[PDB]
Design a protein around this nucleic acid. Structure first.
Length: 65
RNA sequence: GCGCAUAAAGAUGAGACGCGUUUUAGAGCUAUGCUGUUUUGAAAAAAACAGCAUAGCAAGUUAAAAUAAGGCUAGUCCGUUAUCAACUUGAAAAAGUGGCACCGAGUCGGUGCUU
């Protein structure tokens, strides 16, 4: 049916959530490839991605000079 | 929702200067002791020849090399930073790729259809 997506951004992380019409976090079975036994795993649709801060170009410029 | 004043901030790109690092050249020395030693020889002993150890000293400032390895594009140019999930094509770019009604919830487990 209908659904909405919530986001939370920060310099190191992106908290992401997807809500539906009835304010409930959906649970869904997703297929799992590879060569393991679990071919599908029912998980939820919410989390947050972490990553290193994007670096500037000052050091490289100084080294160039 | 701009044209604007004040006070700040950031970012970019060049041009250059102080070192520094590590090498070499800073011709450092003295005495003593050790063995091998051409050694005077048949051996001994060094001139310790070769180094070694013990102490004691003495100066000490600087000069040169490069400074990402390197690259070729031989320029007086480039090379440290953004820009990388798995995956199939596609040279690359780029594209596609994994279901869902429902019940629970320990790194999730099922479930109707059903991959």
């Amino acid at each position: 049916k209908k659904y909405s997506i919530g986001l939370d951004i920060g310099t190191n992380s992106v908290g992401w959530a997807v809500i539906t019409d009835e304010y409930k976090v959906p649970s869904k079975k997703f297929k799992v490839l590879g060569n393991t036994d679990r071919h599908s795993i029912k998980k939820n649709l919410i989390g947050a991605l972490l990553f290193d801060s994007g670096e500037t170009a000052e050091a490289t410029r100084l080294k160039r000079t």
